[PDB]
Amino acid sequence: KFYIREPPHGSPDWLKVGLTLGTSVFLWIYLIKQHKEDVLEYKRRNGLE
Amino acid sequence: NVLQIVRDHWVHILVPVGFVFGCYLDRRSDEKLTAFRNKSLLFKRELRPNEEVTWK
Amino acid sequence: MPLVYMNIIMAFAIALAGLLMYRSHLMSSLLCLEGMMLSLFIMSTLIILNTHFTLANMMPIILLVFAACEAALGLSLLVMVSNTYGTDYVQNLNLLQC
Amino acid sequence: PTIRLQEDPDPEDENLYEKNPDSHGYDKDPIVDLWNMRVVFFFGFSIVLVLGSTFVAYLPDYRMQEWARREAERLVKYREANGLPLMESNCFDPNKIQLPEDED
Amino acid sequence: LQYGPLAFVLGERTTRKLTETSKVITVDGNICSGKGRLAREIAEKLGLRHFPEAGIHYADSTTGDGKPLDVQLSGNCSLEKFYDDPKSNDGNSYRLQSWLYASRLLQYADALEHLLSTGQGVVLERSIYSDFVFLEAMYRQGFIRKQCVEHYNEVKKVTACEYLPPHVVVYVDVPVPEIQSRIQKKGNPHEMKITAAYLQDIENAYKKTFLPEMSEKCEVLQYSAREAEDAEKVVEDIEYLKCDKGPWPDQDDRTFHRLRMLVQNKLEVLNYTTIPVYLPEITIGAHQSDRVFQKFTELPGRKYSPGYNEDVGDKWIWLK
Amino acid sequence: MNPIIYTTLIMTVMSGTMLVMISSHWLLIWIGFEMNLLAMIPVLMKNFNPRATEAATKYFLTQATASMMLMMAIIINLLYSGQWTITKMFNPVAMTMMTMALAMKLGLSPFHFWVPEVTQGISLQAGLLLLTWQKLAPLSVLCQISQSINPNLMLTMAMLSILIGGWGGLNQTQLRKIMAYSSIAHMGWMTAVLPYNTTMTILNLLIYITMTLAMFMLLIHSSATTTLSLSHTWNKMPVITSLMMVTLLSMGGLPPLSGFMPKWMIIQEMTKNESIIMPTLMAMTALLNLYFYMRLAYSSSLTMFPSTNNMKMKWQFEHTKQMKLLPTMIVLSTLVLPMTPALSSLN
Amino acid sequence: MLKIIIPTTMLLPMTWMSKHNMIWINATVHSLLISLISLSLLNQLGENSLNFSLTFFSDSLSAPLLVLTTWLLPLMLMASQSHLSKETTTRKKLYITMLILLQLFLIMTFTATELILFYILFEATLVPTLIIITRWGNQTERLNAGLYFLFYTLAGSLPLLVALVYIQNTTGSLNFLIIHYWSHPLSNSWSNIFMWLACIMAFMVKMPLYGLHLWLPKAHVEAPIAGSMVLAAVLLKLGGYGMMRITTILNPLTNYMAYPFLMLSMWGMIMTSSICLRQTDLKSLIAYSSVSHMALVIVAIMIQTPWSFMGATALMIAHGLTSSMLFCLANTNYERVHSRTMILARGLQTLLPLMATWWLVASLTNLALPPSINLIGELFIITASFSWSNITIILMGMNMMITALYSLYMLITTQRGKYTHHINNIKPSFTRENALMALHILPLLLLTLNPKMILGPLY
Amino acid sequence: TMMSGRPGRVPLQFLPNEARSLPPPKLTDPRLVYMGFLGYCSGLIDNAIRRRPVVSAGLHRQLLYVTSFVFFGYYLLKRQDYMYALRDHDMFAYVKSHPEDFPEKDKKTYGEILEEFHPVR
Amino acid sequence: IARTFYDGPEKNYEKTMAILQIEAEKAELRLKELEVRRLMRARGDGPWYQYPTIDKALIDHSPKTTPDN
Ligand SMILES: CCCCCCCCCCCCCCCCCC(=O)OC[C@H](COP(=O)([O-])OCC(O)COP(=O)([O-])OC[C@@H](COC(=O)CCCCCCCCCCCCCCCCC)OC(=O)CCCCCCCCCCCCCCCCC)OC(=O)CCCCCCCCCCCCCCCCC
Ligand SMILES: CCCCCCCCCCCCCCCCC[C@@H](O)O[C@H](CO[C@H](O)CCCCCCCCCCCCCCC)COP(=O)(O)OCC[N+](C)(C)C
Ligand SMILES: CCCCCCCCCCCCCCCCC[C@@H](O)O[C@H](CO[C@H](O)CCCCCCCCCCCCCCC)COP(=O)(O)OCC[N+](C)(C)C
Ligand SMILES: CCCCCCCCCCCCCCCCC[C@@H](O)O[C@H](CO[C@H](O)CCCCCCCCCCCCCCC)COP(=O)(O)OCC[N+](C)(C)C
Ligand SMILES: CCCCCCCCCCCCCCCCC[C@@H](O)O[C@H](CO[C@H](O)CCCCCCCCCCCCCCC)COP(=O)(O)OCC[N+](C)(C)C
Ligand SMILES: CCCCCCCC/C=C\CCCCCCCC(=O)O[C@H](COC(=O)CCCCCCC/C=C/CCCCCCCC)COP(=O)(O)OCCN
Ligand SMILES: Nc1ncnc2c1ncn2[C@@H]1O[C@H](COP(=O)(O)OP(=O)(O)O)[C@@H](O)[C@H]1O
């Protein structure tokens, strides 16, 4: 028990959890796409594939 | 019975898995030093009609 | 180099030494700082006037502006020091000794 | 107060043999104590010690010392069968060595 | 949004919630006076918030669950032992005095925070401004040493200077024989051991120092034992005061912003209570400190932050 | 102070530093320095007391004299070559004047006296600002003109700074003076490699700023300004003291910590030249800084000092406002040595 | 060889996630498994090293040291868990973390293939040791002991870093193989003399040389038992390994340079062996014994003959094992009587018989009884020194006599006579202590059964 | 100093167009894994400082820490590799364009070179 | 034991040659880089160590109210 109910909610702060997970997912997807584009661009320049 | 004992003794697999991972990483490391495989003046050997590499 | 340049540079050096040497009143040090501004202004103006650089005629104005900014800053600090101690003596500014 | 601190007194030693007359000196809980003793004895004396010493005693001769003996036997046999000095003081053939033409 | 610079730049000011009935009031009286009931009546008549007098376990009531903790984990001092043996060589007297001063400082911070956050006024049953009377009573009776008085004075000098004195100072004057009679009629065995010289020293300190000092910056309304029961008279006497002499009329929004940032962050409030002055009565050795602190974290809801203790029912921890 | 005014002053300090960094004109760099000083003076005086007034006055006098010398050097360079661009500094007398002006702005010995006094007289936030952000502009200017810099003067001042920081730090009980003396020694380490490679200077600057930010943020988290007030922290925040001890070890320069990397690179760069004796002396002198860091670690983390009774009440309250990036600064200040080759992204 | 490095980094989180009463069991079991794994490095070739990757390699000088380290960790775990019983779980995990980090740094140190990485790990070993000593020691002198230990090392090792970077700038590489194949003679120059000093002095301080040996009694006496074990067994051998590695570049300069160090080593051999005769403290006696043995190793490394190097390797291994066992034996009595004075508890053979025979076997191996590996190494070094100069036998001979003298003096003083009357809290020896003694002593005899495994690359 | 001024260089690019002709670092690069480890350590220290269960308190914020460190590390590695490639390119071009400063010396065999012998005794 | 745990000597031999070649190439490259750095810093004809000079695009090529400029 707590005398006052600890402003950081007893349930998760769904807004902050939401945009934190969203920015993590966005960063991972962007990094994957950047890596694929870099691989294709490097293969295109150097005459490999 | 399995659930609680697993949640209690899951830490005993970390070191064996670490050893397996280390063996795999050693294999990956030494497959990068094949620039002289079957090219030494001392061990240059004719490849048998069925194999492809003298050592992995 | 002309001789007036010697005189201006000697004025700057004299003002710098006067600032470096502290007697008692803080006010005199601020006077030396403002004198150093005056000498720098005169030297810049003479060099700028002698070789006809037209666009640098404004930089002595900016130099004077920022000189006034320094003067106001020093005066505010002197006001606060005098309010704390009743005199502008630099001997009182020794609390940070220990 | 004639003191300097509100400090706890120094406690006395807790004899492990008191609550556990057969205590193995590993832990205060008898079950964990017994199992600590067992794992130490099994993995130290049984596994590492005996099996490791057996593994070390039967390591293959990668130091190539029976091979060296066999090679020495072959060269001694060949050289003595042909009236050779059985070892030469020149480790390398002097013909493939170009000394300075003069030191004067 | 927790109050801070951002809440101040946009929107929130506190002079637009001060409604002239705030009037931080503190009631002061000698031991066993009707000050508590007078304060309760004043609070319920004026519509203010009543703060019961800060005891040893006051901080326990504002943290975790309001239930008090063990004396060994909070306080490390008892009032009963001071009444039994006020000269014990373990330092209980000054340890209790300093813990009580810290508790009163915390309560004053909480009252000021409530006042500046809601505008509602508060009523206090004592303050840090009057806690020194017990200090002087102990010192004059030989209960404590002069070094303890110096340590108290240093802490009070570095702590009490950051807050505003109360608007109204209410004093309930009850003479020493009458308070002795009331203690005898109380029923508590421990109090009955209070010598009359102790109460006389408390009274002397209150009249000579607390009221003269508070006169230059506060409204002092003295009363008598028979005037206290009729609290309607006291309330209508408070309604017709002129709060013009203190530092309150000279407070802007920036001073209130600084003070409101100070009253929250109780760690900053209590900062200077634990200064590294090594008095034998209050200094605790490393071994005892480590042991008691380890015991404190073993409490049900005290290991982690107030929202991350699984063993008191906090769920969804991994998503916070 | 009003939050809006404080934010405006901080942004004016930062804009002066940025103006120094982005300007190709000597007059504009001088204006950036002056704007920086003008906005910096009130920040030191945010919490008003006689000590803050003293620190502000001493800082103002030192920086104003440095500005005098810098403008005089600019004017002499203009006289001997009608150039306003920050370049090789065609005149040697002007170059000596400029070097001393910038060194006295930085606090390099023998001009080091102002730094301990000013750091002690201000709060921990102003001290953080002074010892981290106020070093960027003079070091940027010094980097831009390192080709014409005189090795004999700069290396002399750097060695003097290392020696004096190490020696002065040994005598100090207050934490702000310890941080100031460590700052002086690190400044010497930075400026020793300046005539040889400015990339190493920037690397040492970044590592020092990370460690200094971590240390000030730890000292602000645990409101300690003296040795004995920090000796109490283990009874309230043991994790903070452990992190502080690891950060101190990193500050000392012992491997495999982040702090070791800047000295290791500077020594390598100097020995790429002939320069054998001076790095040896620099390391043997940094031993002193390590010594008083270890004294602090002994007092704060590796032993348990006696506490007071009132700490039990602090045990019940949490740290209200948590400074962001404290965790990141600690990690970057300790576990970054394996990423050493990434310094190639600095040139 | 990541198959050994990664299991230790996995020991870390396994310890930090184990439940409160299972930390010692898990740590001991998996450290023993790791030592069993590392035992496979003893299959050495006869001509070149085992070049695993670009950064790690192993020959027959570093493999026994690696095995010694991996074997020593479980012994330290067993010895530590007695005096840490009242300790909170978090700081127990911290202590185990310190030990694990020390092992990891040591393991990477003995196999780092270029000099800068070796230096980095060589000095990284200083932090866990210092934390252990100055945090878990008992007396008030642990602070000063840690300060001495840190600063003696750093003062001698910073010039080594300067010399190493200079050498790489001049020659282009610091990889040991390239350094050996491309080696060139050093000229007789002042610059070369000081570069020799910079390369040698760090390892002299670590051995330690008799002169700079002061930090050792303070550090080994004030340290907790595991700290003493790791200091005496492994951390002293870092200097010997560094000398045996760095010396190839130094020659031919070593011939006229090694004279002061040889003289210091031999006379300090005599001096520190004589000191043990008048030591009223047991741990200090063992520490000075270590100093004299390591002086012998310094002589062996300096004179630079194949027999010298074989004797040095054998002596390093043997001394590690013997000194660890002696420290554990002393700590048992210390935990009994809470004092380190030798003459406090006497006549312990009457009350602790099996512990008395452990004492006897430890003392026998200390004074180099045949055919133990201790005497194998000592005799090889003595023969090499006799070849170097026939007058060395006098000094060597004197040392043997004093070593036997103080070893048997310690045994007689602690174990024989009559038990002191007042002490009544001498409890029977626990199974843990007897197992610890057996696990020190059995490897020594098993190693004298097969002695080529610890004789180095010159074999 | 040495690389500060170079022909055809955009001031604040951080990643020139000519850097795309280089192989990108693999996503399983050990340096990227170390950056992710640094992010995990930052998350754990964040949990411990704020008095939260260190291993399990905030999973979303720990994930954000790890991905932020990995994201910065990828571009940091790209720029590192690009600068090292520039260094090697410039050094090779300078060697090629100044033959008289880097002449190929005559090849001698160990049978011809006379090395002095220093006995060990 | 040899079959289950170890390999032949050819593998270690050839790995050693590969490692030696890599390290020797790195050493010669480091020495070459040091020499190139020394030469460019001495002469200034290389891409490296190019200190800025005044851009000629700032010059005004217009009649200057006086024929002699
Ligand atoms: C090289 C190889 C790798 C090494 C890298 C370096 C080391 C690792 C990374 C370091 C950073 C990571 C963590 C840092 C933050 C943690 C802080 C902390 O306190 O932790 C508490 C926390 C336990 O607390 P709790 O459970 O919340 O509740 C108890 C209370 O919190 C209890 O709270 P309390 O208030 O009671 O605590 C009080 C205590 C608390 O004080 C501390 O705990 C010390 C804090 C450590 C300082 C870290 C600074 C930055 C890191 C630098 C490391 C330097 C390394 C170089 C060598 C030099 C060594 C200094 O303070 C004291 O008592 C005073 C003791 C003074 C001793 C002085 C020495 C301290 C410095 C030593 C640092 C060495 C590294 C330690 C790493 C782990 C330490 C937790 O520990 C953990 O649980 C985390 C351990 C790691 C978790 C990993 C598990 C992941 C999953 C496992 C499986 C693995 C993969 C699975 C896949 C396989 C397939 C099946
Ligand atoms: C309590 C009761 C006591 C009394 C009763 C005793 C009972 C009987 C005991 C008496 C018998 C004496 C033994 C007689 C010798 C026989 C053993 C011998 O044959 O084995 C040796 C071999 O010894 C082993 O090599 C010992 C291994 C060494 C120990 C390994 C280390 C264990 C790990 C522990 C950590 C150590 C760290 C220190 C760094 C290494 C011989 O070497 P080798 O001729 O070639 O091998 C023969 C096999 N070949 C021919 C195929 C090659
Ligand atoms: C506590 C333990 C500390 C560790 C002890 C380490 C000992 C280090 C000593 C190193 C020994 C050799 C150093 C000097 C080499 C030659 C010795 C000296 O006598 O030189 C003579 C020359 O005569 C003079 O002695 C010259 C040196 C004069 C200055 C040295 C005096 C130093 C005083 C000793 C201080 C104690 C050392 C510890 C300092 C803290 C030889 O004549 P020469 O064949 O032509 O020169 C040979 C060298 N060359 C070829 C390169 C030129
Ligand atoms: C402990 C490590 C401390 C690191 C400090 C903070 C880490 C994060 C850095 C923030 C990243 C953003 C900065 C810049 C991004 C875009 C801007 C871009 O234009 O910058 C260009 C290039 O970016 C920056 O210059 C490089 C920033 C890279 C910082 C990371 C290197 C850390 C040093 C090695 C330690 C290992 C750290 C591993 C990660 C923690 C500037 O080119 P240029 O105009 O021509 O430079 C002028 C000044 N010079 C020539 C004298 C250098
Ligand atoms: C007929 C036999 C009679 C005599 C028996 C002799 C006893 C010998 C057994 C003792 C073994 C000593 C341990 C040494 C292990 C070496 C580890 C490593 O070097 O080998 C790995 C090989 O992997 C092996 O499989 C390792 C498995 C050994 C694991 C040891 C664990 C034993 C612990 C048992 C404890 C009991 C558990 C019960 C708990 C209560 C290398 O991986 P890899 O690079 O691929 O192989 C390269 C060579 N190849 C390609 C030809 C195959
Ligand atoms: C526990 C305490 C132990 C402390 C021992 C620390 C001292 C170790 C011995 C000296 C270390 C410093 C050596 C410097 C680094 C070596 C690099 C080197 O040798 O290169 C030389 C450089 O040599 C030097 O410059 C040496 C300068 C020495 C200055 C440092 C003074 C240190 C004290 C000197 C006497 C004390 C040393 C022995 C004491 C032993 C411990 C008691 C060649 O460079 P060039 O300039 O290019 O010359 C040839 C091209 N023309
Ligand atoms: N600063 C102090 N030092 C010592 N004792 C104190 C202090 N403050 C309060 N007390 C004790 O707390 C008790 C309650 O105080 P009081 O308000 O007079 O009683 P009541 O709550 O019944 O009105 C009294 O016995 C008083 O002595």
Number of helices of chain A: 1
**Terminal Cα separation of chain B, in Å?**
44 Å
Number of strands of chain A: 0
Count of all domains of chain B = 1
What structural category do the secondary elements of chain B indicate? mainly alpha
User: Between the first and last Cα atoms of chain A, what is the distance in angstroms?
Assistant: 65 Å
Radius of gyration of chain A, whole Å: 21 Å
SS field, number of helical segments of chain B: 2
Helix content estimate of chain B: 40-55%
Number of strands of chain B: 0
Sheet with the most strands of chain A?
A: none
Name the bound molecules.
Answer: cardiolipin, the ligand CCCCCCCCCCCCCCCCC[C@@H](O)O[C@H](CO[C@H](O)CCCCCCCCCCCCCCC)COP(=O)(O)OCC[N+](C)(C)C, 1,2-dioleoyl-sn-glycero-3-phosphoethanolamine, adenosine-5'-diphosphate
Q: How would you describe the oligomerization state of the chains in this entry?
A: part of a larger assembly
PDB class: electron transport
Keywords: Respiratory, Complex, electron transport
Entry title: Active state complex I from Q10-NADH dataset
Chain A: NADH dehydrogenase [ubiquinone] 1 subunit C1, mitochondrial
Characterization of the model:
Chain G: Residues 112-401 form the NADH:quinone oxidoreductase/Mrp antiporter transmembrane domain. Chain G: One of its GO terms (biological process) is ATP synthesis coupled electron transport. Chain G: Belongs to the complex I subunit 4 family. The structure is cut from a larger assembly and holds 9 protein chains of 9 kinds. Chain B has 56 residues and is mainly alpha-helical. Chain B has one domain (1-56). Chain B has 2 helices and no strands. With 459 residues, chain G is an all-alpha fold. The radius of gyration of chain G is 21 Å and the shape is globular. The N and C termini of chain I lie far apart (93 Å). Chain I is mainly alpha-helical. Chain I is rod-shaped. Chain I is 57% helix and 0% strand. Bound molecules: cardiolipin, the ligand CCCCCCCCCCCCCCCCC[C@@H](O)O[C@H](CO[C@H](O)CCCCCCCCCCCCCCC)COP(=O)(O)OCC[N+](C)(C)C (4 copies), 1,2-dioleoyl-sn-glycero-3-phosphoethanolamine (PEE) and adenosine-5'-diphosphate.
